[PDB]
Amino acid sequence: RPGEAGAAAELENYLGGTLQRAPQGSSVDFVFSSGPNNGKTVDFMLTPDTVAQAAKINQFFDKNLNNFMNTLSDHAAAADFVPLASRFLSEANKTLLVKAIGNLPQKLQAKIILIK
């Protein structure tokens, strides 16, 4: 919850309106309940809940990159936005992530948001 909760709060400043956790059994994470993006869906990734978790993500990012990116494309295809709270990534891994994102189809790249 806290990782995604924080990400949603920040996203609200840039996308407007309010972001609500989707109802139980939804295939998406959050849905905009108001504002100019009202009704649009949001799936989060890379929103670690703890310092420990962020460290784990960082240490093995390269090992997990392919599965992470495939999961990312799946969710970018299905949801309106896929925001990544990537601030915690090492510069080494940010380079990996940005490069990998640039090799996805452009229609998916437009859907991916890097929370600065």
Binding site: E4, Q24, G25, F44, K56, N66, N67, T71
Partner: protein, 104 residues
């Protein structure tokens, strides 16, 4: 927000709530002798902090066991009031496991 990776090309995309729901139930249903299978599959989450687990490295026997373990978890969940909200994703997961080339 996450997935269950079956093999490199075959995945079950899930929301964060679905991911947590599934990994917790499946995780409770492993036999003592099969705990190493869980550890291998759960590695991306437990070692790597990822919101996915993966059966891509298991042989036919390991995956057969994982599927049996998934069906046990699914049974143990039928009792629960939430079950209909999750039934479609249990079905997706069991189906993709069944269709895996290693089980042919």
């Amino acid at each position: 927000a996450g997935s269950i990776v079956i093999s490199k090309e075959v995945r079950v995309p899930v929301s964060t709530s679905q991911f947590d729901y599934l990994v917790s139930r499946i995780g409770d249903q492993f036999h003592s002798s099969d705990m190493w299978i869980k550890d291998e599959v759960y590695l991306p989450m437990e070692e790597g902090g990822m919101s996915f687990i993966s059966t891509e490295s298991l042989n036919s026997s390991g995956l057969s066991i994982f599927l049996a373990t998934v069906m046990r978890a699914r049974a143990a969940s039928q009792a629960e009031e939430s079950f209909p909200l999750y039934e479609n994703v249990w079905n997706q997961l069991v189906e993709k496991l069944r269709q895996d080339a290693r089980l042919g």
